[PDB]
Amino acid sequence: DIVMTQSPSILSASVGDRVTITCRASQTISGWLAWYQQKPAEAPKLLIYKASTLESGVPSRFSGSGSGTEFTLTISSLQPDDFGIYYCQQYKSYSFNFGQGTKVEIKRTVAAPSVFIFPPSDEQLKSGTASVVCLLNNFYPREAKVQWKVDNALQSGNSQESVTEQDSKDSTYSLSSTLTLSKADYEKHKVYACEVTHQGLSSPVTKSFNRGE
Amino acid sequence: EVQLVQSGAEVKKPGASVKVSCEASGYTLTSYDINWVRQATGQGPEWMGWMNANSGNTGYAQKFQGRVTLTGDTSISTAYMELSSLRSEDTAVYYCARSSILVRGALGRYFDLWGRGTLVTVSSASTKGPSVFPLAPSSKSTSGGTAALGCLVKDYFPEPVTVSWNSGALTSGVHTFPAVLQSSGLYSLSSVVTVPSSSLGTQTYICNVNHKPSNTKVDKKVEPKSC
Numbered sequence: 448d449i450v451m452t453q454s455p456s457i458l459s460a461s462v463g464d465r466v467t468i469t470c471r472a473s474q475t476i477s478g479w480l481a482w483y484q485q486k487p488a489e490a491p492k493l494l495i496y497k498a499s500t501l502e503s504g505v506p507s508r509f510s511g512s513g514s515g516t517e518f519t520l521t522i523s524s525l526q527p528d529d530f531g532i533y534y535c536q537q538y539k540s541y542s543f544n545f546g547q548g549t550k551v552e553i554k555r556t557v558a559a560p561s562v563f564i565f566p567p568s569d570e571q572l573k574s575g576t577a578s579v580v581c582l583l584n585n586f587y588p589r590e591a592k593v594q595w596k597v598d599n600a601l602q603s604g605n606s607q608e609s610v611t612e613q614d615s616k617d618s619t620y621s622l623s624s625t626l627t628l629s630k631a632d633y634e635k636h637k638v639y640a641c642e643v644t645h646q647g648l649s650s651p652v653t654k655s656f657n658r659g660e
Numbered sequence: 661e662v663q664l665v666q667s668g669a670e671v672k673k674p675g676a677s678v679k680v681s682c683e684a685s686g687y688t689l690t691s692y693d694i695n696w697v698r699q700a701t702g703q704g705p706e707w708m709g710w711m712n713a714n715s716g717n718t719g720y721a722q723k724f725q726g727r728v729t730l731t732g733d734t735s736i737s738t739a740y741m742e743l744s745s746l747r748s749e750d751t752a753v754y755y756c757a758r759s760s761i762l763v764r765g766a767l768g769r770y771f772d773l774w775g776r777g778t779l780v781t782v783s784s785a786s787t788k789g790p791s792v793f794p795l796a797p798s799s800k801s802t803s804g805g806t807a808a809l810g811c812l813v814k815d816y817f818p819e820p821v822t823v824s825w826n827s828g829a830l831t832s833g834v835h836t837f838p839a840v841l842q843s844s845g846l847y848s849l850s851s852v853v854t855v856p857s858s859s860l861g862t863q864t865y866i867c868n869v870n871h872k873p874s875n876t877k878v879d880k881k882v883e884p885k886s887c
């Protein structure tokens with residue numbers, strides 16, 4: 448095997464920036480190197496082969512260089528659809544090794560989240576548990592603080608968050624925060640509130656409902 | 661169009677074997693090599709082996725010695741990968757990928773076409789189908805002229821679940837979140853969509869949930885929240 452080492456492991460750049468990513472081979476591989484872009488939930492997709500040949504249909508902004516043990520992938524003008532993980536791969540010999548990737552994150556202007564709240568469904572309550580969902584949609588940067596309040600009491604230890612990958616067109620994120628309670632615990636209170644703090648908001652936004660309205 | 665179509669996600673107990681299929685469409689399977697590459701989320705892809713469907717010749721990476729078998733059925737343009745004596749650490753997404761038939765000993769094993777991947781999970785835990793609940797639009801799920809709605813897909817094992825909206829006709833504005841692992845050891849996720857609030861009442865919104873390990877296919881029509 449030939450060990451492929453990539454640098455940096457992560458980078459953050461703005462649309463229009465010139466980006467370079469390097470790949471080092473543990474021993475010479477001549478020009479037998481391919482580059483791929485992997486977008487979320489997708490297989491890697493070929494960009495370059497033979498260190499510098501552009502695969503048909505790949506945008507002209509991508510280019511590759513190097514020989515032997517040191518290789519570089521250049522994106523001349525970074526676009527929102529360029530976010531993802533980039534991998535180099537040697538094909539000089541077994542085991543046709545890939546590097547550990549360079550994660551490319553897109554930077555953009557601050558975008559405040561739009562906040563939505565969902566009470567539990569009547570169907571779920573029938574089954575004995577209440578899931579309350581708070582959605583923070585299409586915001587930037589990813590850092591956001593969500594606090595749950597039930598009858599104004601601050602909650603702790605009964606919620607989970609999930610954040611999406613960056614959007615391929617507008618580079619924003621979305622986030623869900625789900626509060627889970629038993630039907631008995633849910634029926635003990637009235638006011639269910641989701642409080643959101645984010646750089647794009649002048650002051651925290653609260654979305655709330657009263658159990659039954 | 662040229663495609664590689666893979667079989668669905670599977671769950672297997674440790675020590676068992678899994679066999680994934682890969683159907684070539686739009687090109688003749690025997691005119692190229694077929695390769696298998698796996699990836700566990702958080703790591704780089706790991707190439708497993710190659711097969712020439714015309715000659716019956718194969719080559720495997722040393723890491724998979726005596727555990728993998730690549731076979732084919734040229735009559736149905738299908739390649740197969742069987743991985744045996746499964747271990748928890750074999751949990752990964754398995755891809756099939758096309759490369760050129762090389763003469764001995766020319767170079768060119770890079771991948772110009774890939775299947776979408778098959779998640780294989782290795783676990784002793786019981787398979788559990790999800791419960792699907794509506795995230796109904798109400799006066800509390802609007803932002804100006806926009807309404808949000810969705811489906812909550814709760815308590816399933818193992819991953820993955822897929823969600824489509826209106827049988828794949830609705831994709832704009834959809835966010836299907838990455839799953840969370842609950843304290844129970846079961847997963848959960850939500851899929852949401854933002855639409856005009858003026859659309860509620862004329863448009864129909866149905867989430868289509870699929871959990872292949874439990875053979876669960878659920879359609880849930882999402883309507884304005886009951887008061």
Ligand SMILES: CC(=O)N[C@H]1[C@H](O[C@H](CO)[C@@H](O)[C@@H](O)COP(=O)(O)O)O[C@H](CO)[C@@H](O)[C@@H]1O
Binds near residue numbers: 718
């Ligand atoms: C007709 C045929 O089977 N062609 C395969 C070729 O096979 C030759 C022998 O004909 C050898 O090169 C191969 O038997 C070496 O195997 P290993 O990798 O050392 O286990 O290998 C290439 C790749 O080398 C493959 O593209 C190609 O389909």
Ligand code: NA
Binds near residue numbers: 720722
């Ligand atoms: Na071998």
Ligand code: NA
Binds near residue numbers: 538539765766767769
């Ligand atoms: Na080779």
